[PDB]
Design a protein around this ligand. Structure first.
Ligand SMILES: O=C1Cc2cc(Nc3nc(Cl)ncc3F)ccc2N1
Ligand SMILES: O=C1Cc2cc(Nc3nc(Cl)ncc3F)ccc2N1
Ligand SMILES: [Cl-]
Ligand SMILES: [Cl-]
Lengths: 4, 124, 124, 4
């Protein structure tokens, strides 16, 4: 999971 | 927005759609390319091809379970492109590049047409 | 094999599937979550959720155009997860995390359940 | 395009  | 994003989600979705295709699950159209038949999901074909997007947004054609392609289309070229739609991988070879490029032009798959043009230019 | 791969293909396919959903093109099921209705593509739901994969591979249920979820399921939680299926982005907030996690457990979306558990653990 |  990432900060888009 | 303040969303988080799962990097591998789109790739995992496509892998599962290809597994459904393999197992003939919820396939809803047969594409006929002369003597050959290919089963697929209309939504995946529309998401990948400008030609299928136009066909399945048409009020009459959206209801067909069989689509016949132009007789000039090569079944191997179509097969390679169908595999690309479901996997992101294109089996481009010296022996098939002309048929693949011609099929991608017909199907309106601009990124494929682009890589074929570049590979042909490199050989000249 | 000796294939080449287009990096952005899977993301571009998913973006187009979400555009079809927006425009209600070739949606083939309605998911009912108490008083709310959500239209979607069975193939995308199956590709993302172990529960929908089990439902639409069942010989009787594969033919239904309406699926009613358990009344304990929160419509907002379902909406957030449906948006995640079609975009890879999860709108996780302090005010919705418990409903989102409970819905993802029910739908069998293991990666979502994993990030919810981690965000909850960080707050404790 | 890349070599996968
Ligand atoms: O080279 C290409 C690939 C391609 C795919 C599509 N597909 C869709 N386009 C839109 Cl805007 N919404 C939903 C779709 F399924 C249209 C045109 C083109 N041309
Ligand atoms: O957390 C999850 C997400 C999820 C999706 C699926 N989907 C499919 N699985 C297979 Cl093997 N082939 C085709 C599919 F559409 C099954 C189980 C699970 N569990
Ligand atoms: Cl393309
Ligand atoms: Cl997930």
């Amino acid at each position: 999971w990432v900060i888009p | 927005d303040s969303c988080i994003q799962f990097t591998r989600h789109a790739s995992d979705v496509l892998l599962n759609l290809n597994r459904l295709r393999s197992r003939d699950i919820l396939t809803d159209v047969v594409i006929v390319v002369s003597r050959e038949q290919f089963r697929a999901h209309k939504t995946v074909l529309m998401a990948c091809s400008g030609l299928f997007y136009s066909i399945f947004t048409d009020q009459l054609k959206c209801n067909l379970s069989v689509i016949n392609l132009d007789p000039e289309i090569n079944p191997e070229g179509f097969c390679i492109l169908l595999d690309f739609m479901y996997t992101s991988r294109l089996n481009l070879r010296e022996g098939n590049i002309m048929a693949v490029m011609a099929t991608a032009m017909y199907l309106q798959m601009e990124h494929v047409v682009d890589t074929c043009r570049k590979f042909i230019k490199a050989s000249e």
